[PDB]
Amino acid sequence: MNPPPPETSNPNKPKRQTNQLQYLLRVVLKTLWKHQFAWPFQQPVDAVKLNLPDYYKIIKTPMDMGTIKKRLENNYYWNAQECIQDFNTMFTNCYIYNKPGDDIVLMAEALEKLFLQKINELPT
């Protein structure tokens, strides 16, 4: 079955708009989003649709770019590192649930390299 997706709002959580978080939405996320390999990551993994009944029996901190995009648009993060950690969790989840050489893993590897290329230099 599917668990509920990660939260994109939390009224008690402190939030910030920074130049780096603006950039993570305008440049980093919106560039990755258009990549030919982005589509499996644009929404939470649907274990019922995709017939992966063990996905959430294995993956305990799910993350995806649709959640990340909604968090950025909702001003959910305190700083850029928090959002970067969500991207890293998304990539590592894919490596954990699958194995080397899988098509989905090749996709994640390419996106992760583009991601790191984009956050190598951030605005001040």
Ligand SMILES: Cc1nnc2ccc(N3CCC(C)CC3)nn12
């Ligand atoms: C996201 C994600 N993380 N692990 C997986 C395993 C499979 C999967 N799908 C099947 C094939 C893929 C090209 C698209 C959907 N997605 N997936």
Ligand code: NA
């Ligand atoms: Na950059």
